[PDB]
Amino acid sequence: NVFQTRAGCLIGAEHVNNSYECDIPIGAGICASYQTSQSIIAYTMSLGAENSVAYSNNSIAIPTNFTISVTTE
Amino acid sequence: QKLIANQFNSAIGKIQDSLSSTASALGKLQDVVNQNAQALNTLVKQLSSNFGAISSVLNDILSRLDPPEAEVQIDRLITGRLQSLQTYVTQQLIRAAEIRASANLAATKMSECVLGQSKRVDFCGKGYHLMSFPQSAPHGVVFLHVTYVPAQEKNFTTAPAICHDGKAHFPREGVFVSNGTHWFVTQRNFYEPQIITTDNTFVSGNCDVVIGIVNNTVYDPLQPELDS
Amino acid sequence: ILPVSMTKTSVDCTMYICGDSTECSNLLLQYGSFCTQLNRALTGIAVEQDKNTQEVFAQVKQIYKTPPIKDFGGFNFSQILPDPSKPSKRSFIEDLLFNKVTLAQKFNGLTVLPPLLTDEMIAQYTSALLAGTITSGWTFGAGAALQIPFAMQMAYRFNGIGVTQNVLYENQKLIANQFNSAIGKIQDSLSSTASALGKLQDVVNQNAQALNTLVKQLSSNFGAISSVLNDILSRLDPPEAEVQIDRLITGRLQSLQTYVTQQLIRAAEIRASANLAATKMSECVLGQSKRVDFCGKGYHLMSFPQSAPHGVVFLH
Numbered sequence: 001n002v003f004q005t006r007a008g009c010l011i012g013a014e015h016v017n018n019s020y021e022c023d024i025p026i027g028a029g030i031c032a033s034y035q036t037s038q039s040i041i042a043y044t045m046s047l048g049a050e051n052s053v054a055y056s057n058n059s060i061a062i063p064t065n066f067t068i069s070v071t072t073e
Numbered sequence: 074q075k076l077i078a079n080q081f082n083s084a085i086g087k088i089q090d091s092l093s094s095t096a097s098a099l100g101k102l103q104d105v106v107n108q109n110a111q112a113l114n115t116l117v118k119q120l121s122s123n124f125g126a127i128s129s130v131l132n133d134i135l136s137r138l139d140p141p142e143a144e145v146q147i148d149r150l151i152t153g154r155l156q157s158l159q160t161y162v163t164q165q166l167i168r169a170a171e172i173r174a175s176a177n178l179a180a181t182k183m184s185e186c187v188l189g190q191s192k193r194v195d196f197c198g199k200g201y202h203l204m205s206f207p208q209s210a211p212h213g214v215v216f217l218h219v220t221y222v223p224a225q226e227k228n229f230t231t232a233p234a235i236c237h238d239g240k241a242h243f244p245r246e247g248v249f250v251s252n253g254t255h256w257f258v259t260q261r262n263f264y265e266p267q268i269i270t271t272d273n274t275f276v277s278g279n280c281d282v283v284i285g286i287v288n289n290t291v292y293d294p295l296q297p298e299l300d301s
Numbered sequence: 302i303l304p305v306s307m308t309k310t311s312v313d314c315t316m317y318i319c320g321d322s323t324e325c326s327n328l329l330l331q332y333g334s335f336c337t338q339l340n341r342a343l344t345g346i347a348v349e350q351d352k353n354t355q356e357v358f359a360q361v362k363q364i365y366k367t368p369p370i371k372d373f374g375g376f377n378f379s380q381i382l383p384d385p386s387k388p389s390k391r392s393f394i395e396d397l398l399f400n401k402v403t404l405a406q407k408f409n410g411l412t413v414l415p416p417l418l419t420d421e422m423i424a425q426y427t428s429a430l431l432a433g434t435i436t437s438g439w440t441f442g443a444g445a446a447l448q449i450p451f452a453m454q455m456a457y458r459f460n461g462i463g464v465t466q467n468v469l470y471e472n473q474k475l476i477a478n479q480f481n482s483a484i485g486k487i488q489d490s491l492s493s494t495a496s497a498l499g500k501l502q503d504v505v506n507q508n509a510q511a512l513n514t515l516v517k518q519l520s521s522n523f524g525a526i527s528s529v530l531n532d533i534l535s536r537l538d539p540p541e542a543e544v545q546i547d548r549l550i551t552g553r554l555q556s557l558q559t560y561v562t563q564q565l566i567r568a569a570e571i572r573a574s575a576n577l578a579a580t581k582m583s584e585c586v587l588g589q590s591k592r593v594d595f596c597g598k599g600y601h602l603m604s605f606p607q608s609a610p611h612g613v614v615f616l617h
């Protein structure tokens with residue numbers, strides 16, 4: 001299971017056409033993870049979930065409820 | 074009030090549980106201790122090295138060799154150990170500078186986000202900031218930022234202005250929204266519609282200049298009282 | 302314009318000093334653990350280099366995108382929005398910045414590692430931030446993005462600086478024309494002047510100079526007979542070859558130490574700059590700032606980010 005990336009050559013994991021959030025960084029936008037088969041996959045970055053606001057020249061979105069969140073720094 | 078109190082108490086319980094269960098959240102504090110201990114141990118272990126001399130212990134050299142070249146060997150040992158000490162001191166200096174850089178930011182955060190309410194976005198936590206609480210920790214401080222986040226949205230049609238008698242009326246503070254048939258003026262962060270009236274709007278010139286202005290009636294609180 | 306990261310590099314110790322020599326490796330073994338702290342420091346520097354960009358740019362939960370129909374009350378964002386026609390999804394100003402910067406080949410134990418995020422993902426991050434700012438205004442920094450017409454967002458911004466909204470609502474055409482003309486002017490100024498990106502070229506020049514000097518240090522006698530290890534080994538006897546090699550070992554180790562210290566200091570400075578850039582992005586872009594001269598001269602309205610080689614560029 002040999003794969004050739006831009007940051008060297010990785011053996012022991014198989015390439016995947018999908019894309020997920022990174023668990024272990026490798027480089028050049030390539031990461032790896034341990035799915036579930038029970039093998040190690042090497043894939044490409046996933047920046048985040050696609051979104052597109054339904055923007056219109058006379059449309060607004062006003063919240064009707066709130067929530068209090070406590071964050072630790 | 075009761076709902077907000079319950080949300081706050083639940084959040085406090087949740088952060089307490091998260092801290093109690095997961096032990097990997099304090100990396101920013103354990104890293105300093107690990108680095109310092111590793112540097113100290115490396116410096117200590119650097120003692121037992123020949124650096125080109127016969128033996129790593131000077132006692133053997135002085136008790137086994139004549140002074141004329143035992144002095145050369147001892148000199149080599151001093152040079153090596155002195156260089157090691159210089160390197161350790163330099164690394165300590167740089168690390169202390171970094172810790173000072175962190176401490177200044179910590180002091181600023183304590184001054185602003187705790188002793189007052191800050192309007193800097195994404196400085197005292199995600200969302201709109203409400204307050205903060207400090208807690209001590211080994212060689213560090215832990216902040217609890219209480220913030221505010223909107224939850225549930227809607228959809229509305231809007232308008233920059235409104236004609237009522239050829240004039241243009243703008244909201245004092247808030248936006249004009251329509252639920253399909255009527256019109257209302259409401260604040261920009263919590264849906265609470267109110268009837269448009271002269272106490273919520275102000276006038277500015279005729280209404281053939283604003284773009285996208287739709288006209289509706291504006292109530293006046295004086296006429297019904299003056300009628301009777 | 303302000304830098305955000307330097308070239309990610311790493312240098313081996315044993316191969317650098319006297320690579321391809323068993324005798325010199327045995328001699329160097331006596332010097333303790335000097336060959337590992339340098340590698341540890343350089344790896345830490347590389348990790349921090351990745352962390353700087355990851356912290357500065359990755360500030361959005363999702364990836365927003367503009368609606369296909371561009372109707373922004375007369376404001377024209379064509380110069381900064383991503384261009385699908387270009388093979389790389391980068392705007393015109395990003396292309397200008399990339400083409401305005403010019404310029405690993407040595408292999409004596411030094412290597413460069415590619416960044417974790419390629420420039421395409423940086424461009425996508427900037428596009429997401431720009432689209433969120435254009436459509437949702439600033440409410441996408443707190444919770445879910447809420448759509449709002451651009452003219453009303455500008456009215457809110459005007460009310461932010463103490464000017465009533467009726468000032469904007471009656472001068473929409475003039476404001477739009479001024480904004481478009483300003484965008485054209487800044488594009489022309491960037492495309493014309495050549496010394497507009499010194500703050501990024503300086504870092505590259507400094508790193509190249511440091512690496513070149515470190516490599517050039519190889520050819521110094523350091524008091525020994527010659528700088529060629531093979532000649533010393535194959536011409537003199539081991540009893541004196543050892544003491545001759547010792548001087549070269551000491552000198553090369555000293556040069557490596559000096560280079561590592563310089564890299565550490567420069568990395569600290571770059572980290573300070575990256576933290577400043579992250580704060581500016583979190584405040585000037587994701588919201589409106591009341592701090593004077595923080596997000597541009599005069600009263601502040603909004604900001605638009607763009608990427609650049611090893612840095613970020615703001616338009617206030």
Ligand SMILES: *[C@@H]1O[C@H](CO)[C@@H](O[C@@H]2O[C@H](CO)[C@@H](O)[C@H](O)[C@H]2NC(C)=O)[C@H](O)[C@H]1NC(C)=O
Nearest residue numbers: 064065066067068075076077079080083224225
């Ligand atoms: C605003 O949201 C809160 C929670 O986010 C709602 O409070 C919940 O209300 C339901 C009833 O529909 C209860 O079953 C839950 O126990 C409540 N949650 C808590 C934490 O007490 C609240 O009702 C929402 N407000 C409106 C007007 O819908």
Ligand SMILES: *[C@@H]1O[C@H](CO)[C@@H](O[C@@H]2O[C@H](CO)[C@@H](O)[C@H](O)[C@H]2NC(C)=O)[C@H](O)[C@H]1NC(C)=O
Nearest residue numbers: 229250251252253254255256257265266267268
């Ligand atoms: C838009 O809001 C108005 C104001 O509440 C609604 O009009 C009222 O609707 C309630 C029922 O929801 C009736 O009991 C009142 O008599 C109505 N008053 C008036 C003056 O119309 C209106 O129904 C809402 N429209 C939609 C589509 O929800």
Ligand SMILES: *[C@@H]1O[C@H](CO)[C@@H](O[C@@H]2O[C@H](CO)[C@@H](O)[C@H](O)[C@H]2NC(C)=O)[C@H](O)[C@H]1NC(C)=O
Nearest residue numbers: 235236237238239280281284285286287288289
């Ligand atoms: C606001 O109301 C006025 C009428 O009270 C509308 O003005 C009319 O517009 C039509 C078409 O533009 C003209 O033919 C009429 O002569 C106008 N009447 C007056 C009295 O001016 C106007 O259209 C309304 N606003 C909008 C956005 O439709």
Ligand SMILES: *[C@@H]1O[C@H](CO)[C@@H](O[C@@H]2O[C@H](CO)[C@@H](O)[C@H](O)[C@H]2NC(C)=O)[C@H](O)[C@H]1NC(C)=O
Nearest residue numbers: 371372375376377378379380393481484485488
């Ligand atoms: C936004 O501005 C750009 C200028 O960069 C406009 O593109 C030019 O438009 C003029 C006429 O409007 C043409 O003659 C040029 O050939 C265009 N150049 C390019 C590179 O596109 C663009 O049209 C403007 N936006 C809108 C909606 O008109």
Ligand SMILES: *[C@@H]1O[C@H](CO)[C@@H](O)[C@H](O)[C@H]1NC(C)=O
Nearest residue numbers: 003013014015016017018042
């Ligand atoms: C999916 O992955 C396989 C190998 O795992 C590859 O041959 C194929 O080209 C990929 N699909 C596409 C559409 O490229």
Ligand SMILES: *[C@@H]1O[C@H](CO)[C@@H](O)[C@H](O)[C@H]1NC(C)=O
Nearest residue numbers: 053054061225226227228229
């Ligand atoms: C508002 O309308 C748009 C398009 O009609 C839709 O995509 C969006 O989900 C709506 N908002 C809500 C809160 O339902």
Ligand SMILES: *[C@@H]1O[C@H](CO)[C@@H](O)[C@H](O)[C@H]1NC(C)=O
Nearest residue numbers: 056057058284285286370372
């Ligand atoms: C919004 O855009 C549409 C085009 O789809 C246009 O017909 C309409 O007049 C615009 N709204 C305003 C208030 O001008």
